[PDB]
């Protein structure tokens, strides 16, 4: 019930990954960041509140069933495979490199 | 005048008794002067003396008479309540034996007095509205 | 303080009946009566009726007692104070004389003199 | 215009708090010592009021969840404690041919600090662990065990909350009010009704019903880690009983230390076991799969197992039967998948080694009831718990204890009164 | 009249809720009718109860109102807290709505009652000392 | 005015002090925010503190104080109580150095205050039986 | 001071076997006995 895109973003530490994730139910969406070898990490919870030592760059908008989340300013840790999840679904996946 | 004492005049006449009134009125709440027996059963009855003051306080309040000790109302004498004249009653009968006589009506009564009082600062809430 | 949405601008013809449509909002439609007011092409303004949410009460004017349909539903209560309800609205012996913007109205007060008194007015809904 | 503050005292208004509620009374529940019940009982409805409920962020069952277990705790003080019975046991089976119940000796202790006694008894296997027969009681490499008085009762009591003066409860009387929203009538009353503190397990038992059609809960239904609250309108007929014919044997353990065992079974020795109306819970089961559609859809398919794991009193209907705690395997009510004379019998055991709640630091043991065990009860609830498309499945559950109550205290409020408003209006005093 | 009870107008007009005031200063402190669990619970209520209700009196009695239902004061009524008519509210508007909108400025108001009784006692300790 | 706050004035003159009564007027109650130390300890203060409050608002309303910050009444200052000049009074020594020199006979003035009262609604008793 | 006031020109009706005091102050007494041989020793052992 999770459709998340785009699979992958090819961008450069300096510009914005925005990566989408429409939802045909209504709920509490979060997303998460997994970097290569290491474990998923909260980023943003219940749609838009920013979780505890994530910068502000990191943001997430919602209207309607679409929820969206960008990357103020890419890093060069910023580079991974980014989640979205409603209850127990979670997306396939958009690794930025 | 005889400083009878507390509760000196319970025998006699509801004449008598009417004119000694802040004498009762001192030691029904007495004063001032911690897990054992006594210790929770003092702090229970110290308790229970207060909620029965504020109720006597409270019933006083919403009738008008809240710092009286002495107070005259509005509701009339019911000659159902009792149809005695007002000499056979100040001079004659006691404060106990005029309690029992009353014990039935002592309820209408007190209803009596509350819309009485109710129904006299809505009419000054009126009279002070201009 | 709320909307009092309606229907569209149906227009039929003489002889039928038309349905009319006012959805409450923003206030608690069973406190306030609900009055119905239309101006034709031929007169003024002219006082229909109230009918009573709460009550369930109708009074009307003796010009439109034999033709007017004025029933409420119950609120869905949104909050305390706020709730949903609606109110509607239909004619008998229809003609091209009552050809006219049809509005509802939200009772003015709670208690007093002016209990009923057309305040918080719909948006209009035109007739044949 | 010429418009003066005035003040007003004893005006219509609260506000939400929680405070300390008192019990109010007409046994462990300790409920000769609450305020005997008024006979009566003063509802005033609160006309044009609506207010907005919550059963899941309620404090009256947060505060009776704990005012039992304190009540438990409470009541166990003065029994006596089993300790020295934490001895290897030697035990074998009771003669029949399933070998459940187990038949152990052990040395105890006697009123003189010197003498030893080869006392037996029975003990379900439920309580008993082996060593490497020897046995020991299950509790011991865990904690101590208290042995419940046999003079307090086990019976849930009908028990009344109250608000403090100043203080007031808000009934909600919508015949179809859901747990949360806002309840469009409203009243108060001074004390809640006849509160049975029944300890269920996923079937409600001796709860109240619902009037007009049968209700579900849960919070947020869509969450499948909520539990979801039926409660039924019309009471379906569970009747449950040990058939064995126990007896009950004194042993003098110390200076006034009687530990009660099971002497021996008269009689036959049988199954204890749980029977329902087979028609009933049909039409029961439909009810429930009824109000389901109005949530997933009127086309999805809805099926019932049983449970999917976990410890014992939650994966069997566990409660209360003359004084001994079944452990009833629901497998038989719930498999049934619904798309659009007759007595279902449950296998239930026995268990005397229970800690409750779920504490870990405390067990009790309940010494047998002597005689034959039945009781009659209605189960009245039902406790689900769903488990990725269309088609939904529902297994029974039993996580947290305060749901019990909850599903008795929905209709329910805790508010404070202030009766102090300040409004203006063309008013002074004089000089 | 109509006897609607305890709260029976909490979703009634403030000009009908303010005729019933007597009705909900009874059942305020209620009253009367010793270790184990709701026995110090009920201990703990009715001391809580007595704690609330004198400080509704002794806020009452800090602002000359100590006896009133109804109480007419001095402090004007600043637009600021609500720049609602009179007609609007009194058959309007219910108590719980009032509260609502007053809540914020509802302690600037306490402060202003205090100070307005001070100086007025003040004012009739020089009007008696002669 | 200035804000000293609570026993703000108590070095001060007694006509400074007398006029910031209602600061030590809302303070002597304070207000509302089970079983260990603390716990028992705790509602042991509680109590005592109502209890306290209302000796002091029953002998107010003996008095026919009740609701009076600032009350006149109509005991005469006995020059053997304090000899000294009302100038010498309000704007020199403080409320701590005067109840001091009253401390002796400040049981006397109690009970004349009692009296003093009840010979006063008994003599309205007789001027409203008419 | 052990203040007792006369009643003067009064008449009560007493009973001694309906009174209270006695029954709540042998419960007083009951109840201070078993308060007092809490801390005590328990002579347990001593049943040998
Ligand atoms: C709950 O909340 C609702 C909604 O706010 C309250 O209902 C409203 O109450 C107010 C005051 O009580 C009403 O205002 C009054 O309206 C009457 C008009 O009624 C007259 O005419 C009606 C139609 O012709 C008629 O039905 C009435 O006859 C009786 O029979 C009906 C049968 O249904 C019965 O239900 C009625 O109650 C009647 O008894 C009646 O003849 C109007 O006459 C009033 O004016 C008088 O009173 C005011 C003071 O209140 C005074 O100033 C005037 O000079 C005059 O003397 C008054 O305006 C209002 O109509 C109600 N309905 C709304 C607002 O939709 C309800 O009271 C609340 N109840 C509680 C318990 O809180
Ligand atoms: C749990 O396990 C315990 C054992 O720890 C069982 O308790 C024992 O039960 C057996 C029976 O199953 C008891 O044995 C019986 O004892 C009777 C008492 O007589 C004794 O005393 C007389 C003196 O008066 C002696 O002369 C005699 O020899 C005995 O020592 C006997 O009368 C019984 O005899 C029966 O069997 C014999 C041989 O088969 C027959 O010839 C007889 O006619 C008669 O039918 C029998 O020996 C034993 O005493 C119990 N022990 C204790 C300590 O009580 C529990 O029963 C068991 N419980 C369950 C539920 O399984
Ligand atoms: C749900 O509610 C049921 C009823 O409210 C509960 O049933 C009760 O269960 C208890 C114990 O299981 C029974 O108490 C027993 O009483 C009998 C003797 O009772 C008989 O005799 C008396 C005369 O004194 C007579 O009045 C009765 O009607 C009986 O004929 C003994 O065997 C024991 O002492 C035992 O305590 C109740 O009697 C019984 N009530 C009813 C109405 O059947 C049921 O237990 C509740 N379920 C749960 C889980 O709590
Ligand atoms: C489960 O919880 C969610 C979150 O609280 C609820 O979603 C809200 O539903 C209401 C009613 O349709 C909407 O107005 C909100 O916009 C929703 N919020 C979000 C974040 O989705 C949902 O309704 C709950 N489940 C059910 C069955 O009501
Ligand atoms: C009680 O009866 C049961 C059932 O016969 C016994 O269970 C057997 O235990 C032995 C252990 O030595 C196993 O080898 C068997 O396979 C078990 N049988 C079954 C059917 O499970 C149990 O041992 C008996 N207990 C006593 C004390 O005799
Ligand atoms: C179990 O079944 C019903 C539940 O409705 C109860 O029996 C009825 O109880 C009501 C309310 O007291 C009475 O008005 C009916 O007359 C009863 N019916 C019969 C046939 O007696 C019964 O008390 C319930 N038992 C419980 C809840 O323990
Ligand atoms: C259960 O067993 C007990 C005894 O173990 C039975 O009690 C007996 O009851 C009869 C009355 O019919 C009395 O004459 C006996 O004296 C009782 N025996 C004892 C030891 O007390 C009881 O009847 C049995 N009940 C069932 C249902 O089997
Ligand atoms: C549960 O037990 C009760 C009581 O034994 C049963 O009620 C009896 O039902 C029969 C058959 O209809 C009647 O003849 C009896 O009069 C009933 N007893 C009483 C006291 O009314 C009930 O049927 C049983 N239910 C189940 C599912 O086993
Ligand atoms: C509850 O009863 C069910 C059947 O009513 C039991 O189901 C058995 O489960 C085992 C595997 O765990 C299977 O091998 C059996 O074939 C099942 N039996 C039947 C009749 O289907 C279930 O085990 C029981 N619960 C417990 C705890 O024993
Ligand atoms: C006296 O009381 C009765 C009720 O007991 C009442 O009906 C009657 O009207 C009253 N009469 C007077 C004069 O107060
Ligand atoms: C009060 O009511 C009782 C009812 O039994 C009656 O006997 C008694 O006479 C009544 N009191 C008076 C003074 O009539
Ligand atoms: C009791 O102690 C003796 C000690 O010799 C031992 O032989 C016997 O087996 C013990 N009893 C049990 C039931 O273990
Ligand atoms: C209860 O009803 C309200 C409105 O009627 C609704 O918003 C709420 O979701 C319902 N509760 C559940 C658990 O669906
Ligand atoms: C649940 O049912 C399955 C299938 O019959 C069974 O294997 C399992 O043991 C049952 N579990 C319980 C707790 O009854
Ligand atoms: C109203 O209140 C404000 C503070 O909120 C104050 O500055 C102003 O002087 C007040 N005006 C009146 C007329 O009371
Ligand atoms: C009271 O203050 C809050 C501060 O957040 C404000 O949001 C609210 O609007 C204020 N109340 C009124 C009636 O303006
Ligand atoms: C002053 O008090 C004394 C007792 O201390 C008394 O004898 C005397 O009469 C009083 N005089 C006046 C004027 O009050
Ligand atoms: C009060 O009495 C004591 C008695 O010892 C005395 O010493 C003291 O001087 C008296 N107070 C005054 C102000 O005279």
């Known amino acids: 019930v999770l459709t998340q895109s785009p699979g992958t973003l090819s961008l450069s530490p300096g510009e914005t990954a925005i990566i989408s994730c429409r939802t045909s139910q209504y709920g509490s969406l979060a997303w998460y960041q997994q970097r290569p070898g290491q474990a998923p990490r909260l980023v943003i919870y219940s749609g838009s509140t920013r979780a505890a030592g994530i910068p502000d760059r990191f943001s997430g908008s919602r209207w309607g069933p679409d929820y969206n989340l960008t990357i103020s300013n890419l890093e060069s840790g910023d580079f991974g495979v980014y989640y979205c999840q409603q209850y127990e679904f979670f997306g396939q996946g958009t690794k930025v490199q | 005048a005889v400083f009878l004492g507390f509760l000196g005049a319970a025998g006699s006449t509801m004449g008598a008794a009417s004119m000694t009134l802040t004498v009762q009125a001192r030691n029904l709440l007495s004063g001032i002067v911690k897990l054992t027996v006594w210790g929770i059963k003092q702090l229970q009855a110290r308790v229970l003396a207060v909620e029965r003051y504020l109720r006597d306080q409270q019933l006083l309040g919403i009738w008008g008479c809240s710092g009286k000790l002495i107070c005259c109302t509005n509701v009339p004498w019911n000659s159902s309540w009792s149809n005695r004249n007002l000499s056979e009653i100040w001079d004659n009968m006691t404060w106990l034996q005029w309690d029992k006589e009353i014990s039935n009506y002592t309820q209408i009564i007190y209803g009596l007095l509350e819309e009485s009082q109710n129904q006299q600062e809505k009419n000054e809430q009126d009279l002070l509205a201009l | 303080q709320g909307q009092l949405v309606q229907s569209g601008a149906t227009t039929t013809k003489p002889g039928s009946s038309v349905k009319i449509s006012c959805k409450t909002s923003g206030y608690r439609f069973n406190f306030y009566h609900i009055n119905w007011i239309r101006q034709t092409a031929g007169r003024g303004p002219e006082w229909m009726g109230w009918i009573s949410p709460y009550s369930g009460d109708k009074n009307l004017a003796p010009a439109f007692q034999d033709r007017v349909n004025m029933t409420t539903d119950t609120e869905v209560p949104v909050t305390s104070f706020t709730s949903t309800g609606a109110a509607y609205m239909e004619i008998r012996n229809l003609t091209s004389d009552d050809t006219g913007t049809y509005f509802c109205?939200?009772?003015?007060?709670?208690?007093?003199?002016?209990?009923?008194?057309?305040?918080?007015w719909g948006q209009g809904t035109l007739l044949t | 215009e010429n418009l003066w503050v005035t003040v007003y005292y004893g005006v219509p208004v609260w506000k939400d708090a929680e405070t300390t509620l008192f019990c109010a009374s007409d046994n462990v529940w300790a409920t000769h010592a609450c305020v005997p019940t008024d006979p009566n009982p003063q509802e005033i409805h609160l006309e044009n009021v609506t207010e907005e409920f919550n059963m899941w962020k309620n404090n009256m069952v947060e505060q009776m969840h704990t005012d039992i277990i304190s009540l438990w705790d409470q009541s166990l003080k003065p029994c006596v404690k089993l300790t020295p019975l934490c001895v290897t046991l030697q035990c074998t089976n009771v003669t029949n041919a399933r070998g459940e119940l187990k038949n152990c000796s052990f040395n105890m202790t006697t009123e003189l600090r010197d003498k030893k006694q080869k006392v037996y008894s029975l003990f379900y296997r439920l309580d008993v662990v082996q060593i490497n027969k020897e046995y020991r009681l299950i509790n011991c490499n865990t904690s101590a065990i208290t042995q419940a008085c046999p003079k307090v009762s086990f019976e849930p009591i009908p028990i009344h909350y109250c608000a403090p003066a100043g203080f007031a409860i808000l009934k909600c009387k919508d015949k179809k009010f859901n747990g949360t929203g806002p309840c469009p009538s409203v009243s108060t009353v001074q004390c809640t009704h006849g509160i049975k503190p029944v300890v269920s397990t996923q079937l409600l038992l001796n709860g109240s019903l619902a009037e007009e059609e049968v209700m579900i809960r849960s919070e947020n239904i869509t969450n499948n880690a909520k539990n979801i609250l039926v409660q039924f309108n019309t009471p379906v007929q569970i009747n449950c009983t040990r058939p064995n014919n126990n007896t009950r044997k004194s042993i003098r353990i110390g200076p006034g230390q009687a530990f009660y065992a099971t002497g021996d079974i008269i009689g036959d020795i049988r199954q204890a076991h749980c029977n329902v109306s087979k028609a009933t819970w049909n039409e029961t089961l439909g009810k429930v799969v009824k109000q389901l559609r109005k949530h997933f859809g009127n086309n999805t398919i809805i099926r019932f197992a049983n449970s999917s794991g976990g410890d014992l009193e939650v994966t069997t209907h566990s409660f209360n039967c003359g004084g001994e705690f079944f452990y009833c395997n629901t497998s038989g009510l719930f498999n049934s998948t619904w798309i659009s004379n007759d007595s279902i019998t449950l296998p239930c055991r026995i268990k005397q080694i229970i800690n409750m709640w779920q504490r870990i630091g405390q067990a009790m043991y309940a010494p047998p009831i002597q005689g034959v065990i039945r009781c009659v009860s209605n189960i009245t609830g039902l406790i689900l718990t769903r488990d990725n498309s269309t088609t939904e499945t529902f297994r029974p559950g039993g996580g947290d204890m305060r749901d019990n109550w909850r599903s008795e205290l929905y209709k329910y409020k805790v508010v404070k009164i202030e009766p102090l408003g300040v409004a203006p209006t063309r008013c002074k005093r004089r000089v | 009249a109509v006897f609607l009870g305890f709260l029976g107008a909490a979703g009634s007009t403030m000009g009908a809720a303010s005729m019933t005031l007597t009705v909900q200063a009874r059942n305020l402190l209620s009253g009367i009718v010793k270790l184990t669990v709701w026995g110090i619970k009920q201990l703990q209520a009715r001391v809580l109860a007595v704690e609330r209700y004198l400080r509704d009196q002794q806020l009452l009695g800090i602002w000359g109102c100590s006896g009133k239902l109804i109480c007419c004061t001095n402090v004007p009524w600043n637009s600021s807290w609500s720049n609602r008519n009179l007609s609007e509210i009194w058959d309007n508007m219910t108590w719980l709505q009032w509260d609502k909108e007053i809540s914020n400025y509802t302690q600037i108001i306490y402060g202003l009652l205090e100070e307005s009784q001070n100086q007025q006692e003040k004012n009739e300790q020089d009007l008696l000392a002669l | 005015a200035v804000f000293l706050g609570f026993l703000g004035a108590a070095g001060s003159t007694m006509g400074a002090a007398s006029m910031t009564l209602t600061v030590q007027a809302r303070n002597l109650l304070s207000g509302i925010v089970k079983l260990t130390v603390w716990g028992i300890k705790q509602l042991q203060a509680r109590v005592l503190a109502v209890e306290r409050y209302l000796r002091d608002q029953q002998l107010l309303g003996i008095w026919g104080c009740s609701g009076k910050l600032i009350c006149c009444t109509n005991v005469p200052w006995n020059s053997s109580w304090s000899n000294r000049n009302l100038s010498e009074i309000w704007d020199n020594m403080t409320w701590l150095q005067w109840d001091k020199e009253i401390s002796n006979y400040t049981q006397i003035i109690y009970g004349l205050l009692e009296e003093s009262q009840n010979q006063q609604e008994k003599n309205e008793q007789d001027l409203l039986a008419l | 001071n052990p203040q007792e006031i006369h009643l003067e020109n009064v008449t009560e009706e007493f009973n001694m076997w309906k009174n209270n005091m006695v029954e709540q102050m042998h419960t007083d007494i009951i109840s201070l006995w078993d308060q007092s041989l809490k801390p005590c020793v328990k002579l347990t052992p001593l049943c040998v």
């Open positions: 109205a939200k009772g003015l007060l709670r208690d007093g003199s002016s209990t009923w008194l057309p305040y918080l």
